[PDB]
Amino acid sequence: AGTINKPKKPTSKRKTTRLRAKISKRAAEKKRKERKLARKNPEWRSKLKKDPGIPNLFPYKERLLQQIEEERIRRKEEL
Amino acid sequence: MRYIHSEETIPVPENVKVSIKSRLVTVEGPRGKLQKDLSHIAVNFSVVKKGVIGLEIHHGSRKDVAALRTVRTIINNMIIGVTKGFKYKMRYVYAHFPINVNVEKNAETGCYEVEIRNFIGEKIVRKVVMAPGVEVEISKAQKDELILSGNSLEAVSQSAADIQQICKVRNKDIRKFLDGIYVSEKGNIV
Amino acid sequence: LRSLTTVWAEHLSDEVKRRFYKNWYKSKKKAFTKYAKKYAENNGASITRELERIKKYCTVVRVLAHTQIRKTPLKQKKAHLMEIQINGGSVADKVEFGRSLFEKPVTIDTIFEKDEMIDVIAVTKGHGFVGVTARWGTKKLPRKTHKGLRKVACIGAWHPSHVQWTVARAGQMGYHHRTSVNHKIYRIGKGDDEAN
Amino acid sequence: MGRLQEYQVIGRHLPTEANPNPALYRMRIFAPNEVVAKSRFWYFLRGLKKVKKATGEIVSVNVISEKHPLKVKNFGIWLRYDSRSGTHNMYKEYRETSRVAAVEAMYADMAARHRARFRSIHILKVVELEKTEDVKRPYIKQLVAKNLSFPLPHRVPKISTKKIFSAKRPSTFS
Amino acid sequence: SSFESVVVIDGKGHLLGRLASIVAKQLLSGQKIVVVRCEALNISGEFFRAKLKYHAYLRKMTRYNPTRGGPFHFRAPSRIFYKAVRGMIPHKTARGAAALERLKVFEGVPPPYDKKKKMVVPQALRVLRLQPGRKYCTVGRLSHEVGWKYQDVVARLEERRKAKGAAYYERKKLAARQLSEAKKAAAAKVDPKVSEALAAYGY
Amino acid sequence: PSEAGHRLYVKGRHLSYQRGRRNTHPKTSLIKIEGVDDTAAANFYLGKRVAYVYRAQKEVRGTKIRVIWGKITRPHGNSGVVRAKFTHPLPARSFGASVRIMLYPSSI
Amino acid sequence: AKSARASRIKENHQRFKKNIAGPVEAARLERLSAKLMAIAQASGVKSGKSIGRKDSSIVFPM
Amino acid sequence: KNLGMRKNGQVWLPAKKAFRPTKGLTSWELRVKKRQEQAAMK
Amino acid sequence: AEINVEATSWRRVEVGRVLKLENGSLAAIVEIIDHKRVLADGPSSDPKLATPRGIVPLSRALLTPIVIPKLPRGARTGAVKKAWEAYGVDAKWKETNWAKKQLQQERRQSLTDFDRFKVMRLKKQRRFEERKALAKIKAAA
RNA sequence: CCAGAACGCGACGAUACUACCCGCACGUUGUAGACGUAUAAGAAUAGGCUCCGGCCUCGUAUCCUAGCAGGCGAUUCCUCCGCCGGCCUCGAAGUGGCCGUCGGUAAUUCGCGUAUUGCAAUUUAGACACGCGCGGGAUCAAAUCCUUUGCAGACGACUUAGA
RNA sequence: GCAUCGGUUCUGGCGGGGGGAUAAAGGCCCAGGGAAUGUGGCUCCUCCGGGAGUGUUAUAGCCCUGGGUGUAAUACCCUCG
């Protein structure tokens, strides 16, 4: 485009009080409406979230798994 | 992620003298001397070995490390230009109106001038002035062929590009009108 | 560009001396009288010094030339003076050229030639205060239009709350400075030729 | 997130007639001070073992200092952070001289690169990489190289900000 | 911190707004400032960004009458720097007008400033402030592209001034050599009590 | 003859009144002392007398030169600017003018 | 139509100026200059050969 | 001399190497051992 | 094959390089942490030049021309001290032109009023001799 | 190409007086503010400077700097400063270099004076501009109204002419 | 204007005490263990500049554990002047 040699009317970054107030009211209304759809949400939600686990690039994941298995064996022996 | 050290190397032939000061590279060989200012790129030049030029960048980003490859190719092409030279062969082909190409050398400016007449029967005379250091000849071995030789690859290729761009067919079907001057071969003089 | 120095001739005519006065008939006519004495004292050393200053410091050289209005039928006796630029050559050549041309008459045919296009620069015919119809060429309003028909109906019908500088208004017409170009010389006729 | 210290915080549920000797829970908390350490302890314990602050008590709070603060070490930090998508794992590495300094650098890095605040970051494990072969990131691998040496190109000299004018143009070579 | 009669600032290599901030604060403090070589001032960022900003400036004009009240677009580099400085000074007060009268700006180095000491401001120097690899342009180049008419004239005058400075620097080197030999020759004939006394005090 | 100077005071400039963004308080003036660039150096000059010296039109009791006297009270900021109190507030036209900071009352 | 500011029109005019109108105006200038030359030819301090001095400000008053 | 053909015709272009700015940080034997350890862990 | 490269030659930061800090003390580099920090130790017997072992920001230090040869990476204070007085770092620092500038600065800072007056008088006497010598040289050529 | 800042600038002509220029004689004259109001390389910043030996973070430098606000007289020194004149030089908004005369001058040392301003009170001190004075040197001008003109014009204004 | 005070307040320096892992470190010793970004040595290549291999201190050093000096010093926090 010929933007450099012939720029157009600038897009003002100066806000107006009316628009700021309207945007604040709309944001509050959206937050309340989202709370309302959340309290009447019929979508299924799991009791326990899917836990990501241990990263592979962690260098001591193998000994941490050894610790987990040892803790399970100790708990089974105690119980 | 900033890389601590990065290095490139340029081998130098035995008959080539390379001088670098303040990132201004001057390469002289059997065919003459080429010069290029590389001060727009941050680089440490050094002599890592007899006949090897080392290029280093310290604490640079991936883009800064990547610019060394372009600098390497540029200096290598300068060395090739002063050692073997660069030659571009162009061919002009026509259907009905024979293209008349006249090559002169201006004594005042020292540059070559190529005049193209009778392109698709047009009455205008097209004139292209070569970059300095580029020599143009009409080949006697083959038919309707120009040969542009020089030390600067950029100059030779841009001169060939100028000759290709000035003979452009406008407002015609190019599936039918095949007339023009085209770069047919690229290589070295030696 | 800046005028550095100006050098004058030794003898100045009365018609060009009239240009420096508003009331020449009452004056003591003292103009350039002290200047003419520096041609005599020190063998014109100040004149030579100013000529050397023009030679070594200046890039543009213009002569001063005046009309001989007494050869015209005009009732005006005060001549017209202007700077005429010397083009061509080096600055030293221009300085020798002008100094050699001091106090000499230059005819029109040693500056211009027949079959040449020139430019003519002049002030146009004055017409005084003129309405918009003849000053700008606007359309006349219909017959018996209220408050005038040689006018513009709307001068500011939109925003801003101002009259814009682009709107046709009544005022001075003519007596404007104009530079017109590409005028062909058909003949340079000689005044001493009885059949010019 | 500040000058952090690492605190060993031990707490328990209040003793009852049913349970005269409750189990003791220990945590390593990176915190600016002891009040924040105890607050974070009760926050994590509420999230894990369902033991509330009102029904529990702090048994001990201690400071864990670095054993060798003058030894350069490589640290691996396994962390989880919460964003608008959800919870994400990261493994990151830091070349520092102490665990607390690695954790401060981690907090600064996470804020700079992912806009994550202190509240959305869960530090799961901080480890010292025992061997040089345990280093997984190239930005630490370039630092643990043999015979490491580099210059400092384009060093702006330190000039006092109260000295407005200078009679010589400064150099950037030393 | 030092109070001077007038500070001559060589504008070459200086960032426009940072130098303008520093100069405007000095002027309001009460210091006289003369900035020379305003054509060699730098603006950070690509050249096309500065050209776009100057064309966006050239858009603005009073609609009903362009000969009054409208933003008058000054194309010279010194006047671009002057506009940047005047934006940081309360110029519509008497104090602001008084502070503006303590400033002089020029293209090139006209005499007698060619034989005066020119200072640099390191807080606005481009080589110290910009990161290597960023782009920057020149106020003189922007001025020439937006309609300043005297780029070549200032170039020729600056070449003459640099030739005369080269002759002056050769004389300065000769004087430095002669002073060094004078100190070396007179070092033998100075009383050693004076010599190691000055050496102990640090001179 | 002697070709040295005679200055026994430190040079300063009157910058401003004590002010917020909008409201100003002429009861206290801000002074920049030459060569003083931090609070440690500004601590040396606390309590030192400072004179604003100006000229009037009438010759009153042998002179046209009038003085306003004051003292340096406390530092200001971190850059060695100091606050000063004068017997009358300094004129608002004197923003940028020079003042003389004496070396007395001395504690050296 | 090609405008008066068109690049092709400018190049055409430049070729006309160089090849056609140029020699004509050069010969006319030679004739006119020859005629006006015909009309025209028809101590250092104390002599003015060394250039001495003639018989608002850029600096602050100081 | 060159025996192979370059596709874009710039036959003077040198035989380039791969752009691996992280080259030389880890050896081959160590990476093989880490491959075995990671496979066992997985 | 003639290659002539006129370029820069910085001082490198590595194990064994001695740094001058802002307080004037010295510190040999033991280990490089990253591109902005090093671990450094100054085991000098001179209290003005000594530095405790710790992290040094490279922005807060300057690269001296002294490098201790074959100082091992990670060496403790005893090994660094043995290498320090083995190499004689204090003497080389004393002949370095940075320490001469620092010594001149301290000498000029410690001067009293009588000291400055005596400086003026002795400098005027030396200046008189130097002026006579300069007149002889300039009159000669 | 058109206008030409009516608070932007340059060159030149003639300049009557109380006008102009020079000297000293001072201001109940004025000034956004003297008090050592000292100091010219250019250029690069992933490179520079050099006396060619070396040197470069650093103006924390260099110059100057003592004497009644700086006296009087010697001892001593040929160093520094200034006014004029000559020859050169300097046009970006014009000024420096060399030489010569004259005047002043602690680099060294000494003799007489300083008091009383009373224990501080701007250290009234610089530069520029303006003005009033003398004593001299130099010079005897224009513009407007008016009459007139019509290349102009509502009126002013403008182009002319009036010895 | 100065001195000696009173009231309020801003700011600088000095001498002590206490705590914690009776700071953690660290220096110098004693006794074990281990490794490489393997020092010396040895072997093999070279552009003769330096690389590659071996392995545990040699013609450098490092890491881990326990003990002594030691109620060490210092940081930080609290506190009396």
Rounded, the Å distance between the CA of E176 and C1' of J41 is 13
Q: Map tokens 């600064």 to a residue.
A: D108
* Contact assessment for residue I81 and residue E179, using Cβ atoms and an 8 Å cutoff: no
G48 CB near a chain C CB, below 8 Å?
yes
Tell me which chain E residues have a C-beta less than 8 angstroms from the C-beta of I132.
186
Tell me which chain B residues have a C-beta less than 8 angstroms from the C-beta of I1.
12-17, 50-51
Nucleotides of J under 7 A from a protein CB: 1-3, 8-15, 28-48, 50-51, 55-67, 69-71, 78-80, 86-96, 104-105, 107-108, 120-125, 127-128, 140-144, 149, 151-154, 159-163
Rounded, the Å distance between the CA of B4 and C1' of J53 is 38
- Please state, in angstroms and as integers, the Cα–Cα distance from residue C123 to each residue in C64, C173, C182, F9, F58, following that order: 21, 12, 17, 70, 60
Nearest C-alpha in B relative to H15: B73
C-alpha F64/C-alpha C38 separation (Å) is 52
Is chain D in touch with chain A: ≥3 Cβ pairs within 8 A? yes
D119 CB near a chain F CB, below 8 Å?
no
- Residue C160, Cβ density class (10 Å: 0-12 exposed, 13-18 middle, ≥19 buried): exposed
* Contact assessment for residue C39 and residue C51, using Cβ atoms and an 8 Å cutoff: no
Cβ of I10 within 8 Å of Cβ of D173? The answer is yes
Residues ≥6 apart with Cβ < 8 Å to C149: C140, C141, C142, C143
Q: Which residues pair with E14 in a beta bridge?
A: E125
Rounded to the nearest 5°, which phi and psi values hold at H27?
-80, 170
* Contact assessment for residue F52 and residue E16, using Cβ atoms and an 8 Å cutoff: no
CA nearest to D129, candidates D58, D72, D64: D72
Label residues F8-21 b or e (16+ Cβ within 10 Å = b).
Answer: eebebbbbbbbeee
Label residues B75-91 b or e (16+ Cβ within 10 Å = b).
Answer: bbbbbbbbbbbbbbbbb
Tell me which chain B residues have a C-beta less than 8 angstroms from the C-beta of I8.
44
Q: Which of D80, D91, D125 sits opposite A57 (nearest CB)?
A: D91
Output Rg (C-alpha) for chain G, integer angstroms.
25
C-alpha E194/C-alpha E179 separation (Å) is 20
Q: Which residues pair with B182 in a beta bridge?
A: B91
Residue I61, H or E segment: strand I61-67
Residue G14, H or E segment: helix G7-16
Q: Which of B65, B77, B187 sits opposite H21 (nearest CB)?
A: B65
C-alpha F56/C-alpha C10 separation (Å) is 57
Gapped junctions in chain E, after residues (C–N > 2.5 Å): none
Q: Kindly compute the dihedral angle of the four CA atoms of residues D24, D28, D33, D35, in this order, to the nearest 10 degrees.
A: -30
Give DSSP secondary structure letters for B49-103: ETTEEEEEEEEE-HHHHHHHHHHHHHHHHHHHHHHT-EEEEEEEE-SSSPPEEEE
> By what technique were these coordinates determined?
cryo-EM
The secondary structure of D139-161, three-state, reads: HHHCCCCCCCCECCCCCCCCCCC
Q: Which of E30, E98, E99 sits opposite F13 (nearest CB)?
A: E30
Sheet holding D24-31, edge to edge: D24-31, D5-13, D56-64
* Contact assessment for residue B127 and residue B93, using Cβ atoms and an 8 Å cutoff: no
C-alpha D57/C-alpha D38 separation (Å) is 10
Chain C window 92-131: which residues touch G at a Cβ cutoff of 8 Å? 97, 100-101, 104, 106-107, 109-113, 116
Please tell me the total number of residues recorded for chain A in this structure.
79
Peptide bond connecting C160 to the previous residue in cis, omega within 30 degrees of 0: yes
Rounded to the nearest 5°, which phi and psi values hold at D4?
-90, 150
Cβ of B59 within 8 Å of Cβ of I35? The answer is yes
Tell me which chain D residues have a C-beta less than 8 angstroms from the C-beta of H25.
138, 141-142, 145
CA nearest to G37, candidates C101, C62, C86: C101
Residues ≥6 apart with Cβ < 8 Å to D38: D9, D58, D61
C19: its two tokens: 């240009």
Q: Does residue E21 sit in helix, strand or coil?
A: helix
Q: Map tokens 């006796």 to a residue.
A: C77
- Around Cβ I16, how many Cβ atoms within 10 Å? 20
Peptide bond connecting I57 to the previous residue in cis, omega within 30 degrees of 0: no
Rounded to the nearest 5°, which phi and psi values hold at E60?
-75, 130
Give the nucleotide at minimum CA-to-C1' distance from F39: K11
- Residue I18, Cβ density class (10 Å: 0-12 exposed, 13-18 middle, ≥19 buried): buried
DSSP annotation of E50: H
| Residue ranges with strand state E in E120-170 | 136-138
Instruction: Work out the minimum CA distance from E193 to partner chain F, whole angstroms.
Output: 26
Sheet holding B52-60, edge to edge: B3-11, B52-60, B44-49
Q: Which residues pair with D12 in a beta bridge?
A: D24, D57
* Contact assessment for residue C54 and residue C7, using Cβ atoms and an 8 Å cutoff: yes
- Please state, in angstroms and as integers, the Cα–Cα distance from residue C188 to each residue in C105, C196, G24, G37, following that order: 17, 9, 19, 19
Rounded to the nearest 5°, which phi and psi values hold at E106?
-145, 155
* Contact assessment for residue D79 and residue D90, using Cβ atoms and an 8 Å cutoff: yes
CA nearest to I40, candidates D70, D128, D146: D70
- Helices C91-100 & G22-41 angle (0-180, nearest 10): 50
Instruction: Work out the minimum CA distance from B51 to partner chain H, whole angstroms.
Output: 17
In angstroms, the first-to-last Cα distance of chain B is 44
What value, to the nearest 5°, has the Cα angle with vertex D87 and ends D81 and D91?
55
C-alpha D126/C-alpha D73 separation (Å) is 12
F20: its two tokens: 């917020």
What phi-psi label fits residue F19: left (phi over 0), alpha (psi between -120 and 50 degrees) or beta?
Answer: beta
* Contact assessment for residue B47 and residue I1, using Cβ atoms and an 8 Å cutoff: no
Give the nucleotide at minimum CA-to-C1' distance from C27: J142
C-alpha F78/C-alpha E77 separation (Å) is 36
Enumerate the H helices of C18-130 as residue ranges: 33-36, 45-57, 91-100
Q: Map tokens 């500038």 to a residue.
A: I101
CA nearest to F54, candidates F5, F97, F11: F97
C-alpha A41/C-alpha B126 separation (Å) is 77
The secondary structure of chain F, three-state, reads: CCCCCCCCCEEEEEEEEEECCCCEEEEEEEEEECCCCCHHHHHHHCCCEEEEEEEEEEEECCEEEEEEEEEEEEEECCCCEEEEEECCCCCHHHCCCEEEECCCCCCC
H32: its two tokens: 């093989």
C-alpha C85/C-alpha C58 separation (Å) is 13
CA nearest to D90, candidates E65, G18, A53, F33: A53
Residues ≥6 apart with Cβ < 8 Å to B181: B90, B91, B92, B99, B101, B116, B146, B163, B164, B167
C4: its two tokens: 């550095």
Name the residue closest to J139, CA to C1'. C34
Q: Which residues pair with B37 in a beta bridge?
A: B24
C65: its two tokens: 């030339």
* Contact assessment for residue F7 and residue F14, using Cβ atoms and an 8 Å cutoff: no
Q: Which residues pair with B134 in a beta bridge?
A: B150
Rounded, the Å distance between the CA of F101 and C1' of K29 is 63
* Contact assessment for residue I44 and residue I50, using Cβ atoms and an 8 Å cutoff: yes
CA nearest to I107, candidates E199, E187, F35, E193: E199
C-alpha I79/C-alpha I74 separation (Å) is 10
Label residues B162-186 b or e (16+ Cβ within 10 Å = b).
Answer: ebbeebeeeeeeeeeeebbbebeeb
Label residues C18-46 b or e (16+ Cβ within 10 Å = b).
Answer: beeeeeeeeeeeebbeeeeebeeeeebbb
CA nearest to I81, candidates I46, I41, I23: I41
Give the nucleotide at minimum CA-to-C1' distance from C171: J154
Residues of chain D with a CB closer than 8 angstroms to some CB in chain H: 133, 138, 141-142, 145
C-alpha B53/C-alpha B49 separation (Å) is 7
Peptide bond connecting E112 to the previous residue in cis, omega within 30 degrees of 0: yes
| CA within 13 Å, CB half, A54 | 14
Residues ≥6 apart with Cβ < 8 Å to E5: E32, G60, G62
E152: its two tokens: 């070549």
Cβ of A59 within 8 Å of Cβ of D78? The answer is no
C-alpha B134/C-alpha B32 separation (Å) is 13
Q: Map tokens 């005297």 to a residue.
A: E150
Tell me which chain A residues have a C-beta less than 8 angstroms from the C-beta of E59.
7
What phi-psi label fits residue I105: left (phi over 0), alpha (psi between -120 and 50 degrees) or beta?
Answer: alpha
Chain D window 21-60: which residues touch F at a Cβ cutoff of 8 Å? none
Instruction: Work out the minimum CA distance from B62 to partner chain D, whole angstroms.
Output: 13
Cβ of C110 within 8 Å of Cβ of G36? The answer is yes
C-alpha B81/C-alpha B72 separation (Å) is 14
Chain B window 21-80: which residues touch H at a Cβ cutoff of 8 Å? 62, 65-66, 69, 73, 76-77, 80
Beta strand B100-105 pairing with I17-21: unpaired
- Residue D141, Cβ density class (10 Å: 0-12 exposed, 13-18 middle, ≥19 buried): middle
- Please state, in angstroms and as integers, the Cα–Cα distance from residue F57 to each residue in F60, F64, F66, F93, following that order: 9, 6, 10, 17
CA nearest to D105, candidates D88, D92, D90: D92
C-alpha I2/C-alpha B28 separation (Å) is 10
Name the residue closest to J128, CA to C1'. G61
Beta strand F81-86 pairing with I37-42: unpaired
Q: Which residues pair with D127 in a beta bridge?
A: D76
- Helices E77-86 & E16-29 angle (0-180, nearest 10): 60
Please tell me the total number of residues recorded for chain D in this structure.
174
Q: Does residue B147 sit in helix, strand or coil?
A: strand
Beta strand E33-36 pairing with E7-10: parallel
Residues ≥6 apart with Cβ < 8 Å to E135: E44, E45, E46, E47
Q: Which residues pair with B117 in a beta bridge?
A: B100
C-alpha E89/C-alpha E95 separation (Å) is 9
Q: Map tokens 């050397």 to a residue.
A: C52
* Contact assessment for residue D135 and residue D141, using Cβ atoms and an 8 Å cutoff: yes
C163: its two tokens: 């009259």
- Please state, in angstroms and as integers, the Cα–Cα distance from residue A69 to each residue in A65, A66, F9, H39, I101, following that order: 6, 5, 83, 19, 68
Output Rg (C-alpha) for chain H, integer angstroms.
18
- Around Cβ I2, how many Cβ atoms within 10 Å? 12
